[PDB]
């Protein structure tokens, strides 16, 4: 059923599936303590997850999978998906990470808890800005991340991935890119996904380092998503 969409219909479906940009519960009229930063991020991420889950259901081909595989994919990809969203939002804000419109993180703040993770997220963000990443391309890449998270039902995922690839190529071709440019742009975008996978695993480690240190008040949901990674 997802294999019967056009490239324009695929883009249209993915754009409609997009979750909203959420706000943090940061109070601007009151002085912000640096030690409460992880509290804001945890609270934010936990609320983002619900919107992400319903976004996944609206990704063509996802519901066609069994409940088990839907769970495994979401468990594997959730931090990656949060990160590519974060990276996308931080494009027009050079040097900083836009977790929320009312939650901007600068490099020196990272030195209070995460500096290495910060620099990699910025580098990924600026690279998207350098490549002038488009919103249509963004939703394709994010859907690819979801479907490609599981390392170890099978052929269906493959056919949908090919479908999103054609969609991406169709977008680049519609923009006026030559055949060579389409291949090169497609290559660079998917190579950035490896960096996103890398950052996700490091962030997961960082989350374990703090969860064991009783530094991050996590929800039952986040504990469940985190425990999936050993």
């Amino acid at each position: 059923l997802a294999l019967s969409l056009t490239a324009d219909q695929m883009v249209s479906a993915l754009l409609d599936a997009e979750p909203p940009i959420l706000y943090s519960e940061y109070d601007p009229t009151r002085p912000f303590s640096e030690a409460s930063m992880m509290g804001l991020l945890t609270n934010l991420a936990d609320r983002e997850l619900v919107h992400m889950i319903n976004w996944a259901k609206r990704v063509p081909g996802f519901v066609d999978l069994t409940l088990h595989d839907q769970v495994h994919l979401l468990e594997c990809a959730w931090l990656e998906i949060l990160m590519i969203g974060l990276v996308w939002r931080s494009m027009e804000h050079p040097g900083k990470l836009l977790f929320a419109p009312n939650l901007l993180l600068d490099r020196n703040q990272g030195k209070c808890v995460m500096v290495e993770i910060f620099d990699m997220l910025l580098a990924t963000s600026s690279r998207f800005r350098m490549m002038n990443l488009q919103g249509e391309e963004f939703v394709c890449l994010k859907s690819i991340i979801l479907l490609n998270s599981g390392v170890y039902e099978k052929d269906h995922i493959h056919r949908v991935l090919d479908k999103i690839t054609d969609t991406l190529i169709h977008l680049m071709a519609k923009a006026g890119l030559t055949l060579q440019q389409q291949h090169q742009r497609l290559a660079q975008l998917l190579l950035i996904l490896s960096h996103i996978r890398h950052m996700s695993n490091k962030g997961m480690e960082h989350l374990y380092s703090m969860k064991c240190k009783n530094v991050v008040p996590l929800s039952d949901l986040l504990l469940e998503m985190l425990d999936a990674h050993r």
């Binding site: 889950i53 409940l67 839907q70 769970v71 949901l221 469940e224 998503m225």
Partner: peptide
């Protein structure tokens, strides 16, 4: 699993 409940509808 909480993810199961949220994945409904």
């Amino acid at each position: 699993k909480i993810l199961h409940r949220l994945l409904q509808d």
